[PDB]
Design a protein around this ligand. Structure first.
Ligand SMILES: *C/C=C(\C)CC/C=C(\C)CC/C=C(\C)CCC=C(C)C
Ligand SMILES: *C/C=C(\C)CC/C=C(\C)CCC=C(C)C
Lengths: 282, 329, 195
């Protein structure tokens, strides 16, 4: 029908939307029953990218089927075309593993720049902040940025801090976002190598976040992880030794100060309960 | 403020609608919706498995097109031996397990190159005994389970480094007794199912503190009767499988509150359409429909076939293949 | 710990009147903020339409918690928060506003009030301050005679409606909700995650 050209126009509208505006915060769905005359469903307001709902029922299966044809070698696509379709495909359904795998091959072949995928996933995590495959792909991309060939490099800390931001924002959009906090932990293990400095900075900054999300056991587990990792590293940067029993008593105080303020939340109960385990085993 | 939990209404279902559930799964996908198909095709193979198993548990597997599915599965096998979620998609250990599970239900594992499947799974194990989802190296305890679950149904458990595989899973056990996706992860009822299922297959349940872990699992039950996966999470019917199956494996199922949980599961039915939602009054789907039925079967629902807590399949099916792991007495 | 809505109404004999409201739809997705704000307006009015004079109640929904205070002089005040936010601090905020509301606005402007006619710019000031209860004023005079624990609780907002009263017929019929907001409720596309 006319859908063949109405949709193929959109995949360029989205691609051109990124060239026009590099600083796009989030993507979103705009409630729209039917198409507006000669108006693209791709609406760019401020730093926000909107997609009118009427086109989604047409846009997705077009791009979806196009990638599968490429994967099965039923239809050839330019590497520029391949990037464009996978991009619009993953903004609609980031759980589509194969599309991510295709981009992996592009990155590994040298066609695609790894940073472009980080920013892509970052946008996808605004509409789908809990999408498992997105976090999975992120780990592969990050792992490729270390295999390029002690405190990690300056560029590494730039990436790590970037991971702390997206894991935090994704934790704010969905309550008890397991996959988000699990990724944040994974970063500190492989990207930061349990750096004593970063562990402390993470412990300090997230203390306020925990007070504003008391029912988020995933966030409080991150607290437990930070503390548990500090014990492993300590067996200036030598002060956490005397501070180790002090941080644990500060944490149990901070938790008690929340249970007395906000009773009922079993997370706070479970958190303190877990902190007790740390103090008893030293 | 009250605890975060659902409130079961009086007009909510309290009777097992076994027939309407069979009709729901049977008429699923009948509507020509291209959008919904594409959206969920990335896990379609697992979707088939959920659909067929819940029908077999109700003894209505015959209502499903055996031949059409068996063709689909044979098309989803690749050169590397792995099975993808659907035709065209990339192979993955998840849908490799789902495919084998389906072929086992239909007693036709020969439709697929069994030897290649074993090779694919074996080539996913790392040096530390962990398992990856595919060739891209994503590590998860789910994959450790999917590996041995696939091989056990093929009678090829000794193909992989069993001793080293067990070594890794035990390194994912947290102090609370639970398991995560990776070492140092937050305990998750779903991840616990995989690990307890793993250790059941590899015969290492003696490495599990049944009292401690069973305690953690029983803490998932809320005043409504429903179960969740983690502390302060809304009750979910799918977790009435992940939690119960773990309990049955470690031998602590009797600790749970039978009737209250049963009334929760039944309350998540749809009197009009059929199938189970995650909570009473929500949209239903084949996923929650299976684990709702499977949960009731574990609780002792006599209208439903006894389900194996490890492989999530009818016991009679796993009796034929001589694969029934010894559980904790 | 979040505050979504904070409005002051007047329960008349014929209809319920919106006088002044404050919103904070920043936590929501951008292109849905317009619709969400309208629902919180539609909700707050519907609560008062089912609330008797001189009673306190807390209507609970999934991941959302509404707190209503309808005084004896039919001056209603509704605050909408999440499940984390304590009800005691919610009713405390409702009381300190309704008292300072009669101080600045006369009682004769209540039955014919309007968001453009009523002069009360102290709502956004309080809504943003009472976000974190550990930063709010410690009014012990209010909380002393506040809670008799007679706060009626509701599992859903269906408990307020009649026996055969469908909520869907209250959404698509409302003149408060926009045409895209009515669709937003029907085309809610019920949540999917954990599949
Ligand atoms: C909300 C629940 C989710 C997202 C899934 C929780 C379950 C998990 C994490 C375990 C996954 C288990 C797998 C993939 C094994 C295959 C499943 C069965 C054999 C039932
Ligand atoms: C979690 C998402 C679900 C359950 C939707 C996808 C379901 C399928 C795919 C199952 C369809 C196949 C049959 C009913 C045989």
């Amino acid at each position: 029908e006319e859908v063949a050209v109405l949709v193929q126009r959109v995949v360029k509208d989205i691609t051109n939307a990124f060239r026009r505006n590099p600083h796009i915060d989030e993507i979103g769905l705009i409630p729209c029953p039917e198409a507006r005359y000669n108006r693209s469903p791709i609406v760019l307001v401020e730093n926000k990218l909107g997609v009118e709902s009427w086109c989604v029922k047409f846009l997705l299966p077009y791009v979806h089927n196009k990638l599968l044809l490429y994967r099965t070698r039923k239809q050839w696509l330019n590497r520029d075309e391949l990037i464009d379709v996978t991009c619009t495909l993953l903004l609609l359904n980031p759980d589509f593993t194969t599309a991510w795998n295709v981009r992996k091959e592009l990155i590994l072949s040298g066609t695609l720049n790894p940073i472009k995928d980080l920013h892509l996933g970052k946008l996808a995590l605004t509409k789908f902040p809990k999408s498992p495959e997105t976090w999975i792909h992120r780990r592969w991309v990050l792992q490729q940025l270390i295999q390029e060939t002690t405190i990690p490099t300056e560029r590494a800390q730039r990436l790590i801090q970037e991971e702390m931001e997206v894991c935090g924002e994704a934790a704010g959009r969905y309550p008890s976002n397991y996959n988000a906090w699990s990724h944040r932990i994974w970063v500190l293990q492989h990207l930061a190598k349990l750096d004593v400095k970063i562990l402390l900075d993470e412990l300090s900054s997230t203390k306020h976040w925990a007070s504003m999300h008391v029912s988020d056991h995933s966030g409080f587990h991150y607290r437990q992880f930070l503390l548990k990792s500090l014990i492993s590293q300590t067996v200036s940067t030598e002060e956490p030794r005397i501070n180790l029993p002090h941080l644990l008593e500060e944490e149990v105080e901070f938790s008690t100060d929340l249970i007395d303020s906000y009773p009922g939340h079993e997370t706070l109960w479970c958190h303190r309960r877990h902190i007790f385990y740390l103090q008893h085993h030293l | 403020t009250p605890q975060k939990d659902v409130i079961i209404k009086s007009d909510a279902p309290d009777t097992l609608l076994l027939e309407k559930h069979a009709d729901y799964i049977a008429s699923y996908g009948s509507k020509k919706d291209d959008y919904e198909y594409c959206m969920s095709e990335y896990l379609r193979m697992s979707g088939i498995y959920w659909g067929l198993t819940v029908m077999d548990l109700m003894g209505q597997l015959h209502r499903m097109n055996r031949e059409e599915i068996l063709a689909f599965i044979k098309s989803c096998q690749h050169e590397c031996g792995g099975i993808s979620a659907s035709i065209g998609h990339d192979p993955h250990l998840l849908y490799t397990l789902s495919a084998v599970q389906i072929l086992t239900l239909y007693d036709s594992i020969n439709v697929i190159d069994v030897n290649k499947v074993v090779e694919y799974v074996k080539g996913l194990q790392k040096e530390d005994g962990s398992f990856a989802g595919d060739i891209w190296g994503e590590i998860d305890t789910r994959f450790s389970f999917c590996a041995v679950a696939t091989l056990a149904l093929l009678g090829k458990l000794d193909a992989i480094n069993v001793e080293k595989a067990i070594e890794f899973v035990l390194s994912c056990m947290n102090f609370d007794g639970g398991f995560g996706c990776r070492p140092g992860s937050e305990s998750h009822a779903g991840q616990i199912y995989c690990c307890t299922g793993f250790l059941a297959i590899t015969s290492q349940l003696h490495q599990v503190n049944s009292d401690l872990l069973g305690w953690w699992l029983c803490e998932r039950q809320l005043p409504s009767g429903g179960l969740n996966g983690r502390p302060e999470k809304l009750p979910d019917v799918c977790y009435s499988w992940w939690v119960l199956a773990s309990l049955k494996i470690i031998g602590r199922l009797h600790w749970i509150d039978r009737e209250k949980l049963r009334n929760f599961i039944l309350a998540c039915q749809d009197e009009e359409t059929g199938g189970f939602a995650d909570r009473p009054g929500d949209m239903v789907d084949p996923f929650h429909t299976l684990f709702g039925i499977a949960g009731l079967s574990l609780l002792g629902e006599e209208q439903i076939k006894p389900v194996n807590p490890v492989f999530c399949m009818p016991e009679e099916v796993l009796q034929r293949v001589n694969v029934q792991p010894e559980l904790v007495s | 710990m979040k505050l979504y809505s904070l409005s002051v109404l007047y329960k008349g004999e014929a209809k319920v009147v919106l006088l002044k409201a404050a919103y904070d739809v920043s936590s929501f997705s951008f292109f849905q903020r317009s619709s969400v704000q309208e629902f919180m307006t539609f909700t707050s009015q519907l609560i008062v339409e089912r609330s008797s004079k001189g009673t306190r109640a807390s209507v609970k929904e999934q991941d959302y918690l509404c707190h209503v205070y309808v005084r004896n002089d039919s001056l209603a005040g509704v605050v909408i928060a999440d499940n984390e936010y304590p009800s005691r601090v919610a009713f405390t905020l409702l009381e300190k506003v309704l008292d300072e509301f009669s101080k600045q606005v006369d009682r004769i402007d209540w039955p014919v009030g309007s968001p453009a006619t009523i002069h009360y710019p102290a709502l956004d000031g309080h809504l943003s301050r009472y976000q974190n209860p550990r930063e709010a004023d410690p009014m012990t005079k209010v909380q002393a005679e506040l809670d008799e624990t007679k706060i009626i609780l509701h599992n859903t907002m269906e408990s307020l409606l009649e026996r055969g009263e469908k909520l869907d017929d209250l959404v698509s019929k409302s003149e408060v909700l926009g045409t895209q907001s009515k669709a937003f409720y029907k085309t809610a596309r019920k949540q999917n995650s954990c599949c």
